[PDB]
Design an enzyme around this catalytic site. Sequence first.
Site, short mmCIF file in Angstrom:
data_model
loop_
_atom_site.label_atom_id
_atom_site.label_comp_id
_atom_site.label_asym_id
_atom_site.label_seq_id
_atom_site.Cartn_x
_atom_site.Cartn_y
_atom_site.Cartn_z
N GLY A 21 -14.90 -43.26 15.59
CA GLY A 21 -13.79 -43.04 14.67
C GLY A 21 -12.51 -43.79 14.99
O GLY A 21 -11.61 -43.82 14.14
N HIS A 135 2.90 -52.18 21.69
CA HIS A 135 3.55 -50.86 21.73
C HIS A 135 3.68 -50.25 23.11
O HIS A 135 4.42 -49.27 23.27
CB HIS A 135 2.77 -49.88 20.87
CG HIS A 135 2.70 -50.25 19.42
ND1 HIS A 135 3.85 -50.44 18.66
CD2 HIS A 135 1.61 -50.36 18.62
CE1 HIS A 135 3.42 -50.71 17.43
NE2 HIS A 135 2.09 -50.69 17.36
N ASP A 170 2.57 -58.73 13.25
CA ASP A 170 1.72 -57.54 13.08
C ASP A 170 2.44 -56.66 12.00
O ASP A 170 3.67 -56.78 11.83
CB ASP A 170 1.77 -56.79 14.41
CG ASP A 170 0.76 -55.69 14.55
OD1 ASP A 170 1.00 -54.59 14.00
OD2 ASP A 170 -0.27 -55.92 15.22
N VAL A 187 15.87 -63.01 26.03
CA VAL A 187 14.74 -62.93 25.11
C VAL A 187 15.29 -62.50 23.75
O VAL A 187 16.06 -61.53 23.69
CB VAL A 187 13.67 -61.93 25.57
CG1 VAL A 187 12.47 -61.92 24.61
CG2 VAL A 187 13.21 -62.22 26.99
N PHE A 192 8.73 -58.65 11.94
CA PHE A 192 8.59 -58.51 10.48
C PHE A 192 7.57 -57.41 10.36
O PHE A 192 6.44 -57.57 10.86
CB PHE A 192 8.05 -59.79 9.84
CG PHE A 192 8.93 -60.99 10.10
CD1 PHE A 192 8.78 -61.74 11.25
CD2 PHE A 192 9.92 -61.35 9.20
CE1 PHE A 192 9.59 -62.84 11.49
CE2 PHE A 192 10.75 -62.45 9.45
CZ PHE A 192 10.56 -63.19 10.58
N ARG A 264 -7.79 -52.01 7.03
CA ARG A 264 -8.06 -50.57 7.03
C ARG A 264 -6.83 -49.68 7.25
O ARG A 264 -6.77 -48.56 6.74
CB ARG A 264 -9.07 -50.24 8.15
CG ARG A 264 -10.52 -50.28 7.73
CD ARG A 264 -11.38 -49.69 8.85
NE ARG A 264 -11.06 -48.28 9.11
CZ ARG A 264 -11.53 -47.58 10.14
NH1 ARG A 264 -12.33 -48.14 11.04
NH2 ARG A 264 -11.19 -46.30 10.28
C1 LIG Z 1 -2.54 -52.91 18.27
C2 LIG Z 1 -1.13 -52.92 17.67
C3 LIG Z 1 -0.97 -52.09 16.40
O1 LIG Z 1 0.39 -52.17 16.05
O2 LIG Z 1 -1.79 -52.61 15.38
C4 LIG Z 1 -1.32 -50.61 16.68
C5 LIG Z 1 -1.21 -49.64 15.50
C6 LIG Z 1 -1.27 -48.19 15.99
C7 LIG Z 1 -1.31 -47.09 14.93
C8 LIG Z 1 -1.20 -45.70 15.53
C9 LIG Z 1 -1.24 -44.54 14.53
N1 LIG Z 1 -0.81 -43.31 15.16
C10 LIG Z 1 -0.19 -42.33 14.50
O3 LIG Z 1 0.22 -42.42 13.34
C11 LIG Z 1 -0.09 -41.05 15.30
C12 LIG Z 1 0.40 -39.85 14.45
N2 LIG Z 1 1.34 -39.47 15.62
C13 LIG Z 1 0.80 -38.41 16.53
C14 LIG Z 1 1.20 -40.94 16.15
C15 LIG Z 1 -2.63 -44.34 14.00
N3 LIG Z 1 -3.64 -43.79 14.76
C16 LIG Z 1 -4.77 -43.73 13.98
C17 LIG Z 1 -6.06 -43.21 14.46
C18 LIG Z 1 -7.09 -42.94 13.56
C19 LIG Z 1 -8.31 -42.46 14.01
C20 LIG Z 1 -8.52 -42.26 15.35
C21 LIG Z 1 -7.52 -42.54 16.25
C22 LIG Z 1 -6.29 -43.00 15.81
N4 LIG Z 1 -4.53 -44.20 12.76
C23 LIG Z 1 -3.20 -44.59 12.77
C24 LIG Z 1 -2.55 -45.16 11.57
N5 LIG Z 1 -3.26 -45.22 10.46
O4 LIG Z 1 -1.40 -45.60 11.64
CA LIG Z 2 16.79 -58.96 23.29
CA LIG Z 3 5.86 -56.85 13.58
ZN LIG Z 4 -0.44 -53.22 13.94
#
Ligand SMILES: CCC(O)(O)CCCCC[C@H](NC(=O)C1CN(C)C1)c1[nH]c(-c2ccccc2)nc1C(N)=O
Ligand SMILES: [Ca+2]
Ligand SMILES: [Ca+2]
Ligand SMILES: [Zn+2]
Length: 368
Positions: A21, A135, A170, A187, A192, A264
């Site tokens: 998942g 992150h 990203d 730095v 964006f 996705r």
């Molecule tokens: C590699 C760099 C990158 O910037 O692309 C990483 C993106 C990370 C997204 C994290 C997101 N997390 C959250 O929204 C959780 C809700 N709070 C407890 C934080 C999240 N976590 C998950 C998730 C879904 C299923 C299983 C585990 C995590 N989905 C999401 C979402 N749709 O934003």
């Molecule tokens: Ca700076």
């Molecule tokens: Ca960005």
């Molecule tokens: Zn991302």
Amino acid sequence: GKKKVCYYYDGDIGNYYYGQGHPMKPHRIRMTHNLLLNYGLYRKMEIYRPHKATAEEMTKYHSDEYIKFLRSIRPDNMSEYSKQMQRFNVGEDCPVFDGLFEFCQLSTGGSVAGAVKLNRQQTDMAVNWAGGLHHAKKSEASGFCYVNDIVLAILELLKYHQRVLYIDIDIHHGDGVEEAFYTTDRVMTVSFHKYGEYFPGTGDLRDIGAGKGKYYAVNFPMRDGIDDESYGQIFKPIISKVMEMYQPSAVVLQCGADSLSGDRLGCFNLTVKGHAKCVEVVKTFNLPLLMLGGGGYTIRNVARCWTYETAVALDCEIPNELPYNDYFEYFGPDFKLHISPSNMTNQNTPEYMEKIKQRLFENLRMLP
Ligand SMILES: CCC(O)(O)CCCCC[C@H](NC(=O)C1CN(C)C1)c1[nH]c(-c2ccccc2)nc1C(N)=O
Ligand SMILES: [Ca+2]
Ligand SMILES: [Ca+2]
Ligand SMILES: [Zn+2]
């Protein structure tokens, strides 16, 4: 003209699994490698297998306790670390998985090795598709990232470069990198990203740095549905103004592919050509450049994107018809490299794009 490109990849990277998942799939790095190999892009690049970065290399930024925890925790002993797991934010987004530490070592190793190669003036561009985990914080994992390979690579570049420019395309705000360098002018961070009811919740256009770093953090907040036309209209003018005012001597570009149409998790509408135009724009300045990966959750499109961006780095034209490869069936029903945008509405009106660009230009006038 054409540049020397060094590419970092470990054949084991694709075997790391975040769990059932979980949207983060390291296998997309292996799909990218196999596609670029089948296009013949290996004949023009120097391919290197990164070393496993040591806990010591990682502590140039991260705390000793956080790195010790990452090196110690395993699925079989998790029960004894419930306290440290909460403290370091290990959970659903950043789970404990078999080989977690080695995955961090390979992701980090490629970024730091690329930075060393650029510092030694042995390459014009260095590519690490397994890096870009923007992150991660000094003592905390976040958003699928555990070790901030970008911050470590920038600290390496700072040994030989007075000013380093970081650009992040990203869809999510590059918060870990922005935070690490928020109070320094050595730095400049430019992100964006989608802003508004979206992870990580930071990256407001009013977040511009603090102390000596004031005006050295740039954020371009966007709404759903940004397309190639709109993104292109602001990216080159902003990056050109940043180059003019800041005059960096090295650049790091995070190429997170979750800004593509059909992602996705993402809500943008860029094509692979629109995303790769950012690489073309940055490459045009002829500065030492480290190209990194990041997000991207529709894995067939991540492989297409990063294969095309590697071809852009090499100034090599490649056909739209995909060559046969180990994952050919993942690219159906069309089996083409380039993608079509969707019919989603672009909520970033032309007036909104111009207005945000003008506010950023006002801040850029404040540099010395
Ligand atoms: C590699 C760099 C990158 O910037 O692309 C990483 C993106 C990370 C997204 C994290 C997101 N997390 C959250 O929204 C959780 C809700 N709070 C407890 C934080 C999240 N976590 C998950 C998730 C879904 C299923 C299983 C585990 C995590 N989905 C999401 C979402 N749709 O934003
Ligand atoms: Ca700076
Ligand atoms: Ca960005
Ligand atoms: Zn991302």
